[PDB]
């Protein structure tokens, strides 16, 4: 049932994007529910078998311009582990099982001739929740990379301080 | 180790924070003991007297006592005629201080050589010095050295 | 595999209700572990291709009672999005893993005749899952609309005893 | 396509891996972070189809190493319900996800000769995330059974220590 | 916006409420500073001498002192004498407030109008009252106005 | 339950501790009365009058005040006398505690009564003792009872 | 006899002068202590408790203490509550003095009677009442009569 | 030796009026000092035998006009003892002294003719120190009569204000 | 008359000589309101601000109060910055003592006449100062003048 | 004229009497009261040439016994100088006095026959008048020898009370 | 009588010695005291007709030595009136009473040949007493004149002084 | 000479008794100082602490202030501590008067040997004690003599 099985999972890839939102940003979660949106919207094509207009070009380029937007912020994109941290876990989970959706769905494609914008959406949606991990990463390290030099240097301060005021006491 | 990190970093700015709470503290403490000693000499070593009787006036407070091996009095004007008679007696002596003064609350202790006027060392002596309530000195306990 | 299949699913079914049952008051918490109660008596009948007794028909009328009590409570279930809070977000993820084990499970009884009452079960357990995220959408959200007016009321409040002091000072 | 369903599932486990690794403790967490290292190797031997050495023996006898340490720990383990503890759930999912995947990379060893290290890795990695549930249900529980004991004990003796006093007034 | 909604009532809440904090402590002030006023004057407005003794003892401090341009008194004694004079000399003239009072700490300064037993506005002044420790008045000082 | 049960017990404990706390309180409280009691009748029970001087010296303070129906007096003098006189004019006579002193703050309240030498009960009487800033006692007032 | 005769009454005069210095100290003191048993039991019988209010508040000290046999206040306020609790339980009743007062120094004693709305003497007390240095009372002690 | 026997005497008697006016006041300390010049001058009529003038008739009329005078303010003169205080004791005295000198001179004036007004003179002035004598008993006493007149007042006054205050106090 | 004579004179010098005590008590009196005028003027009118601390703290005491019509002061510091603040704002002028100061008891009067840095008279005012039990300045009440 | 130079000594006589009584206690003057009326009573008969009644009998036996009384405290009556003290210097003089009126009285009787008892009147007299003086000397002195004594006595105990204080303080 | 009469008189004057000596200093009276005792064996010469021996001629060169003494001290002696004082008083009665006896006994020596040197001792006598006086005037008044000078030079030293004082402070 | 002889005597028993009154005098001084040294030193011999801190509480004041070379304390538990270590420090050892104790005004100087518990002479100190209004030992300052 290559209908019911692409169906199927497309719900539980929206119902995982509807548990990671909670554990983002303002931002992270806006995007994120205008996918759950689009989600929604694709199903009824895919359900429908061509019957109900589907997504619309523009959900595709809006997913392509953010894309494009955190693909400038990562350098170093190769060689990382995913769940850096327990928010950026939430979406690589998310990617994943995007990708067997993206697969179930080329199959309505494939023989419903239906879906041609929802199978690019798909394919392109896995590769900006990476990036999403990848960027929290950054928000969540760079931020606290941050504190870590401060302490750093705070605490080289107050030895010098200490130095200081000890040998000026036995004078 | 990266929660650890930042995590053994503020544990120990916590330590060194408070030592430096500690520590300055005691850097207001021996200079306490500086001033007190100064004050004290400097209404010994003053050679004009007009200007001692002010400054006891002044710093010293109305309820005051002295007591020493030899002498006592009580008051400011007690104690500054007990200072004019020791500088009428020994024109031109000094007082200098000797190491660094100590102590802890209103007490203070400290140890002064008594110079000759050609600059020779015959002796010396340590004191302890009381303030009261308003800031004034109220006490000074002086004693001999060997 | 519809065998191996079916029960793996539903393996990862119950395993999905054993995370969201720490998200959850006492009351649901007790509901969900006699679901996970009741899988585990499922997978026994379809593992033994029926050599094992299944579940009673008590237990799906059991969930009938449950589905009516919180059906009430609803009024507008056709337009909602998944997951409005991270409580309500576990539910929908375990509605959706139901959902293929069932199609699973149907196959099962399609081809040895076993699971007649599990796949009615399984059926009716997607229903009332959804209703719970509803529900708790209501609880979280409703019992929050309360404090709305709360804080709404009090500022009110103390705007006019602020300008009533005010002017009758400079009398 | 076993192969891009098979490959698709081993990345969905190492995904669930990245979560469950922020709610254990250190231990847990370098043991489950070497494992996703190894899913990683893995995913290599499969994906290229025997062109990339795959993982060595002695990352499965790593596991084995691992298995009897915590099996010696736990005394009943027949019936147990999945989910004791929020943590504990988090194990429970990755061990049913691992359980399809392996049944996947079954069918690529059956047809490709390949993964013959990598099928019985995965098959010794499944018992032991059930074990790490279990055991985190022991230290979780143990260690709160301690604290059940010390508040039982400390409440009695302050029952026998009030009643001597008042009467003890009244003399 | 759910959580932010909510939230940003509460911080605006918490603002309203500590103004309010302030804002009540504020008419508080202005009240004691016209009961000080009415009991000031009420003594210099007393027809009845006898009364105004049996007021001062009561309301005025044992030890508390008075003093303006050309008269000065200090006690609940002569503070009464004071009044006395100024009443028999003045018999029917009344002193009427003006202005709001206010003030800070245990100071409050007011100004009044004398009015003559007619009703014509003569002239005014203004006065500053301390209390003592004990609720009673222990220092007025008037001042003139032109 | 197994949570319920845990927070369930730490309420409990919560409540039993504080129990302890204001009960350990109440202990302090009557042995407090007992004390005074004893040091008060222990003066008056006491056959040798010097032993009695320098206990009010020590134990009472300089500025203490007693009154009776009878009698009254105030000062370690006043109340030594006092007390020589009535322990003169009743010889082996003794007082004895009865019942359980109690009482609050600064106050004690308990009764006692009269035995005579040959231990017949022929009467008795109610104090309330009153300490001092320094610890020491300042005021005792006693009553009689039928 | 002319110069003893002079002188003879001159003598006879001093005396009887210093027993009229003597003779009229003992009026005022008598009065004295009536004084405080009519204000003592003008409060108790005052049938409007804000007069009684205002009363203690001027005629008693601050710091000003009382105990009976039942009871105890010390405070203006506290014995203003006790005056206000004793005349709401009896309401119509009265106290009235018997025999005359007395006293010496700061000590004044008086008996009373307490007599029913409707007249009749059903009991009586006796009660010792201290003036402050400020002219204020500072202590009041009753007892009980049979 | 008459004439010797009478100057010896007059220089008696003047020298016993030098005696007397250090215990009278300043009238009759006048008065005695101007008696005593006179007989300075009657001595030295007497001692020249009339060579040398006498005393004037004005100094006997200056007699007979004090004697006017004192002699109202005496009602009883028949029968007082002599020296009623120790100033009128002086004034008697010199009486008697004066009446052996009156004899004295009266045998110059019989033998030698001279000394007429002397002995008119001498005759008056022992008259005058008599009453002078009483006029001071009455000077000292009827002034000591209003004080024992006042605490003899004085003191019924107070036994009466002594009465009304003993049985005003025990009302 | 000379006993007269010689009385006569005892009695006049009698009179004389307490009248100079009488009239050199009228000297101290003059010159000190002088000395309170220098003193507090000569702080007003000190061009150096470190002098005038010192002063201050010396001169007055440490429970010292000021007011005036427009501003007021109480202890060395408050009145320290009030001279601060009134010497900035009015650099080079000067206060000029008018009249002969007079007064009773701790209390000074004296009038003043403000000097503009080019000596033209452009207004003045009066003071009373009052003395503490420590002989320093407790308490300065200014007033103004037309 | 022995009538006239007798009567008039005997003016002097009483006056003089009347001097002495305000230095001597109330006894003494007591005593010289009655001899001035008797005095009084001898210029009588004297001055009546017998016409008139003079004192009788009992008046001189009076003196004799205050003599004998008097007499009797007075050991050593040959050498003792007049005038021991301002009180007995008065009575000597009277006694002197009293002496030439004596031989003047004892003229009168010689050639009148009158003033047999007034003559040993006058003569017992003299004799008291000296014990007198004497007596005033033993009462001013005795007393004043017992001072003597009493400050003697003090000084000598204050000495030793002095010379054991010091050498006890410096033990 | 002449011997009687002398030797009562001289009786009179030693007594009246008596009662002056009370009333002068130390030097005067030990003075009067010898001369009383002289007066005392003047009498006993005269009273036994010569049989007993009289006094010698030192006594009268002792009285010329004291009266030149005296003499130097006073310049004017012609116009004085007796008594200036109380004191002075006392020594001109007993000159006066002196000259009587001086007669008298002048009497005896031209009768009985004897008081040669007790004639010439008492014409002495009643100078030196008269001298005496006059020195007493000088000393109770020359001391007076002292304290005379000495309050009329501090009144004006205090009107000095006030004068400057009050328009000192007006100043 | 009777009258000067008399008077002579009476100016001599004037001076004499005057002599004793100031003699009498200095009787108590010496004592006063020898009491005080004996309270001191009983308390430095006491073999017993229990006795010493009953002692110290009775014969001590609660504000009382010791100084000397080594060590310094105030208050009676200070004192009594420092009491305890020296004892505990040197048992059987004792302090033995030396000399006479002397001194003026609440001031008392006298000087002591220590003697080793088998009798050797070791050392000696002095020291000044002063005495508060409340006839307990408010301030010892010690020193140590060679």
Redesign the interface.
């Known amino acids: 049932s290559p209908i019911i099985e692409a169906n199927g999972t497309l719900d539980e890839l929206t119902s995982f994007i509807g548990e990671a939102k909670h554990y983002v940003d303002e931002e992270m979660k806006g995007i994120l529910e205008e996918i759950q949106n689009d989600i929604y919207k694709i199903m009824g094509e895919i359900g429908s078998k061509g019957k109900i207009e589907g997504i619309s070009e523009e959900r595709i380029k809006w997913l392509e311009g953010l894309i494009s937007r955190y693909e400038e912020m990562v350098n170093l994109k190769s060689f990382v582990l995913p769940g850096g941290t327990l928010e950026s876990a939430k979406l690589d989970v998310c990617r994943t099982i995007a990708r067997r959706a993206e697969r179930k769905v080329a199959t309505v494609l494939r023989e419903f001739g239906i879906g041609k914008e929802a199978l690019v959406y798909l394919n392109r949606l896995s590769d900006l929740l990476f990036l999403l991990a990848r960027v929290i990463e950054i928000a969540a390290?760079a931020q606290?990379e941050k504190?870590?030099q401060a302490?750093?240097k705070?605490?080289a301060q107050?030895?010098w301080?200490?130095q200081a005021?000890?040998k000026?006491?036995?004078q | 180790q990266?929660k650890k990190?930042?995590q053994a970093?503020?544990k120990?700015?916590a330590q060194?924070?408070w030592?430096?709470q500690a520590?300055?503290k005691?850097?207001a403490q021996?200079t306490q003991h500086l001033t007190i000693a100064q004050t004290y000499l400097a209404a010994w070593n003053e050679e004009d007297n007009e200007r001692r009787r002010?400054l006891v006036?002044?710093a010293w407070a109305?309820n005051t006592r002295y007591?020493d091996?030899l002498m006592?009095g009580e008051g400011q004007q007690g104690i500054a005629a007990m200072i004019e008679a020791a500088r009428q007696k020994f024109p031109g002596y000094r007082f200098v201080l000797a190491g660094?003064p100590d102590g802890h609350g209103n007490?203070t202790r400290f140890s002064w050589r008594l110079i000759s006027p050609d600059g020779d060392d015959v002796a010396g002596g340590?004191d302890?010095v009381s303030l009261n309530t308003?800031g004034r000195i109220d006490n000074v306990?002086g004693?001999l050295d060997?």
Chains 1, 3, 4, 8, 10, 11 share one sequence.
């Open positions: 390290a606290l504190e870590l302490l750093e705070e605490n107050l030895e301080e200490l005021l000890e000026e006491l036995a | 990266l990190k930042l970093l503020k120990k700015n060194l924070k030592k430096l520590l300055k005691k850097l021996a002010h006036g002044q109305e007591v091996p006592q660094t007490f340590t302890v308003e306990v004693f060997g």
